[PDB]
Amino acid sequence: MFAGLQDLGVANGEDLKETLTNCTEPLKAIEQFQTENGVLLPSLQSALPFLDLHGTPRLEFHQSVFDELRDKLLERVSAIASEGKAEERYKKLEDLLEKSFSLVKMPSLQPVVMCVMKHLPKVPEKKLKLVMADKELYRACAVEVKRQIWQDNQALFGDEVSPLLKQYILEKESALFSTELSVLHNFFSPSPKT
Amino acid sequence: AILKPRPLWTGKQIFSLIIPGHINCIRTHSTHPDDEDSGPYKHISPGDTKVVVENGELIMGILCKKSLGTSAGSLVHISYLEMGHDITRLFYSNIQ
Amino acid sequence: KAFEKKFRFDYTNERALRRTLQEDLVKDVLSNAHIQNELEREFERMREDREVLRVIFPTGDSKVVLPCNLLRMIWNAQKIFHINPRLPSDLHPIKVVEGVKELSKKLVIVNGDDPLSRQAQENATLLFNIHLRSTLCSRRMAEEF
Amino acid sequence: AGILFEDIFDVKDIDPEGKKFDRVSRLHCESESFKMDLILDVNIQIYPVDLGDKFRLVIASTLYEDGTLDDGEYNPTDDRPSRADQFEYVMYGKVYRIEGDETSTEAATRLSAYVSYGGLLMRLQGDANNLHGFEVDSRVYLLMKKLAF
Amino acid sequence: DAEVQQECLHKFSTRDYIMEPSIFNTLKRYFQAGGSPENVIQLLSENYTAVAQTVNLLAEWLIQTGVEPVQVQETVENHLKSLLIKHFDPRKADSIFTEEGETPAWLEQMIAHTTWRDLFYKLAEAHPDCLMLNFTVKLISDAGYQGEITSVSTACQQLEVFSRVLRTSLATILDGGEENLEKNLPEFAKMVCHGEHTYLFAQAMMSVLAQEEQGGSAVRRIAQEVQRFAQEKGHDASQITLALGTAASYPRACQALGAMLSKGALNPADITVLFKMFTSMDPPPVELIRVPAFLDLFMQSLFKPGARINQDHKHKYIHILAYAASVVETWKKNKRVSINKDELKSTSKAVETVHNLCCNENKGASELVAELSTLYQCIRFPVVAMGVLKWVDWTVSEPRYFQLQTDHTPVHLALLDEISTCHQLLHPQVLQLLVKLFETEHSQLDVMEQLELKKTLLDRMVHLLSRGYVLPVVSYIRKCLEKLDTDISLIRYFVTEVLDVIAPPYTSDFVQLFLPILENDSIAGTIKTEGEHDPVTEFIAHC
Amino acid sequence: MASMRESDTGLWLHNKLGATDELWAPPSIASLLTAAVIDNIRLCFHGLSSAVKLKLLLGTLHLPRRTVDEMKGALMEIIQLASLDSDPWVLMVADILKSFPDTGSLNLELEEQNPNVQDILGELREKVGECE
Secondary structure: OOOOHHHHOOOOHHHHHHHHHOOOOHHHHHHHHHHOOOOOOHHHHHHHHHHHHOOOOHHHHHHHHHHHHHHHHHHHHHHHHOOOOHHHHHHHHHHHHHHHOOOOOOOOOHHHHHHHHHHOOOOOHHHHHHHOOOHHHHHOOOHHHHHHHHHOOHHHHHHHHHHHHHHHHHHHHHHHOOOOOOOOOOOOOOOOOO | OEOOOOOEOOHHHHHOOOOOOOOOEEOOOOOOOOOOOOOOOOOOOOOOOOOEEEOOEEEEOOOOHHHHOOOOOOHHHHHHHHOOHHHHHHHHHHHO | OHHHHHHOOOOOOHHHHHHHEOHHHHHHHHHOHHHHHHHHHHHHHHHHHHHHHHHHOHHHOOOOOOOOOHHHHHHHHHHHHOOOOOOOEOOOHHHHHHHHHHHHHHOOOOOOOOHHHHHHHHHHOHHHHHHHHHHOOOOHHHHOO | OOEEEEEEEEEEEOOOOOOOOOOEEEEEEEEOOOOOEEEEEEEOOOOOOOOOOEEEEEEEOOOOOOOOOOOOOOOOOOOOOOHHHHOOEOEEEEEEEEEEOOOOOOOOOEEEEEEEEOOEEEEEEEEOOOOOOOOOOEEEEOOEEEEOO | OHHHHHHHHHHHOOOOHHHOOOHHHHHHHHHHHOOOHHHHHHHHHOOOOOOOOHHHHHHHHHHHHOOOHHHHHHHHHHHHHHHHHHOOOHHHHHHHHHHHOOOOHHHHHHHOOHHHHHHHHHHHHHOOOOHHHHHHHHHHHHHOOOOOOOOOOHHHHOOHHHHHHHHHHHHHHHHHOHHHHHHHHHHHHHHHHOOHHHHHHHHHHHHHHHOOOOOHHHHHHHHHHHHHHHHHOOOOOHHHHHHHOOHHHOHHHHHHHHHHHHHOOOOHHHHHHHHHHHHOOOOOOHHHHHOHHHHHHHHHHHHOOOOOOOOOOHHHHHHHHHHHHOOEEEEEOOEEEEEEOOOOHHHHHHHHHHHHHHHOOOOOHHHHHHOHHHHHHHOOOHHHHHHHHHHHHHHHOOOOHHHHOOOOOOHHHHHHHHHHHHOOOOHHHHHHHHHHHHHOOOOOOOHHHHHHHHHHHHHHHHHHHHOOOOHHHHHHHHHHHHHOOOOHHHHHHHHHHHHHHOOOOOOHHHHHHHHHHHHOHHHHOOOOOOOOOOHHHHHHHOO | OOOOOHHHHHHHHHHHOOOOOOOOOOOOHHHHOOHHHHHHHHHHHHHOOHHHHHHHHHHHOOOOHHHHHHOHHHHHHHHHHHOOOOOHHHHHHHHHHOOHHHHOOOOOOOOOOOHHHHHHHHHHHHHHHHOO
């Protein structure tokens, strides 16, 4: 649930529990962790008093800030993918994706990684090999990412295609063995286009 | 209509006694300036056009063939449609 | 735009409703949903009649010849009953809607019940019914008469 | 008392569009206290007026100081005291229209009442707080008298 | 304690309780209850998100991708400002501050930024009952940001500060003449006329200044500016203005002027009263009837097409206007000496002829040209010149007038040229009307006639620049050249013909204002041509 | 129109003229000024705020001269009693308006223990003398 945060140096709940298990005073440690390495702005720490005293806990706007900064980052990366020089923006998105595959295991930030990976028209080999090993990560991939997956994975592409062919055969057999027997509508009646 | 300094009746006041029943009609005089309605004084015409009849009373306006002749929606037509034919006959006789 | 803003009879603006209807009527037309649905259906029939008219009468000719003079009848009623069109009125719009609906049935040109006669009767009074609905509206009966 | 309205006016203008009729003149008048404006027709032949003249306008719903109502029929042989004794010029008409600055949401602030004196029209325009006794289809009187001051 | 223990544990069971604002108090209560913190830590292990750290990580990602830190900070601050707007509580804030018993530093951190200053102002205006809001306003004043506190309506309640700021504004107005009055007048008029009492005292002081006959023209002008700015807001004080002057000795004239300026219209009765007063042997001070609004009323009534005036009082209106404008009265120590009536009969005749031309519109412009001798003889009167100026302004202001104006070099602009030649006082007005004419882009005319009209307007601007009204014309032309609202060939023709007609030496001001005009590439690439006498080349060589 | 008592008169005045946002005297002062209110101000003027006094003084001028003629004594009395307050503003306005009931105009006296007035007059006079 909260895996992959440790790679970038931003400790997750696992190391939090590890540190507070052998800690005697949680108050000062939690205050410094939410203050020192937190948002390094006097605005947020100074806003904590008013938002506390309103009765609405600070968790609410903290989560809202996280989600809206996520959305703004995603939309701006989408814009950058369609602004400026193609190679430069693609290299910047490659760097961002390489530094986001550390957090790819975070469902609250999995949309970030997946959208940025969609933003790359050609994902490098190793990251694709990593994502295709997991069911949900494979299934959330964009159309370009799935195209990259199938371009060099014959057996998996065939496995994906096979159920569609099965549905086609089932529909064709049901039409061929249709109870409604008439010349007005038959197997060969519909146009090739439809 | 005018009590002091001396009693005086108006032509419209007397004519309202001729119009039968309670008849409502709005017409326009032949010499009505077409640009008066748009501007101010639409409901108070300086030239006394815009014939208006309410409850069988000639409130304002000057009668001409546009309101007394053989035109659709004229005063005699409204009298015929609203009232009977006998009352309209009395109207025709009384006017003359 | 003008047609909608002149025939819609919005039932959400409470302050506007205050000037036209009494309290016991504005609360009824604001709370009940059956009334709102009926009035919206009335406006839909309004638009359908407009569509029919625009192919019946191309070239945009409004003048038409019809039996009864609705505007003059409304004026006569106003002068008879001393309406004083300044105060709110005790006219529930649903009364207007269902009164028009009932009145339409009473004006018969082709009498019968089989589908042929019903269709002929519907055609023979189509223009008069359209005009009658278009004047005896719910908004016009509350904002203009 | 049945005194709908009472104020002092002065003749700031005469018929601006010209002399349409021989025996009738269109008076444009402004008030002093309520800051009213008035448009009036008078029988200029029997009650001559000039520019700058001042008069007291008293629109009353009845001519009897006691306040009783009248049938509206000419009965010259009447003995009851009347307001007309202290006034020079009297009309008797019927208000036919009341306009205003009404909107779909709030009420009106500036009103305008038109009354027709057997053909001679008159428009009284001002603020909504004064034209309260004016209700459409009601007979009123004019009762104006010149102020020589 | 057990019930409180269950409540605290259920709170801990919620998502991400580590980010609570009272987590210190909750942990204190849990410690007091005697429960082991092991359960709390175990619950928070699955209930911790770095919603304070991952925001920084995504901000670093934004910086690396290309987002400038300024926009990141602005977005974060805007979101926090909105969250503070939605989450304010007065009474618990007051209780917590009373418990603190001191001035917090984080409040000062809020004070450092302008967004929180505006938020604190809005909070203070929202709830008068909270002492914290006045406390924060006072602390903002202490920190030096009392300018953020409202002062547009505060100066009205303040006597000395308002008076001194008025003094400084008027001194700066007189420093730069009109060229700085046009800039220092809006805000000064706003602050003066925001309150009526300050307006009245300003008028009283300024008119007392205007009492002196020497140098009082600028003083009267500034007083009239204040009066007209007050009138623009729908606020009327004309009667007080009349009472400030010498209107006492003439109660009838005071009445007539007050009534007309209160209504804003001209009534024939008061016009006749003024005619009787002035035609009599004891006329009043002519300056009282020279209010800009009153003369503007005369001009509007006597010159506006479509406006009708009584034919039986037309001559009286003309006579009153002529006596107001052309008649000169000698005064000493606020006492009348003599009255000049030289320009009374001919002036009235000229005004009558011009008014007949103005309000008899059905006649074509060709008939107007046919009477050019009388027209040009009568146009030399400055008031009549302004009258024809605004009459042409209102006629050509019609969108359909251009279709009726069938000359590539219309006679109207010739009349404007004559107006500019006759008087220099109208040159600001001529420039303003030319600016309005040129800036009006027409979509119901062919672009060919648009180009012809624009070229003729350029000729008019060249003429205006020739007669000494140069600096505002030059600035406007440069603004149009840089504004892309003028064709390149148009400015080409303008500058080429200007340097064709003007001759050296050129002043430092003109050279300074004209060098950037030739700096633009649209001129450097067009007017610069191979010739022995190149205008741009010769002007550059002259520097 | 009754002689509504002192404190009540002050409350009514601060209800009709208490709008701090409306720093301009309303046009309603034409009808709001009657004999009873002005007479009652003789004692409740101390109960009026400075803004109320200023707006009342401004609105006193917006009256027809028939009303002024028939309210000579009351208007002079209210001017005199407003000329005995702590506010220098009301003192100066009472002195300026004392001439209105007599001549219909306003008095113009200055340079009297008003530092801003004297300094502004002097600086503007010398500035005009610089650039006549």
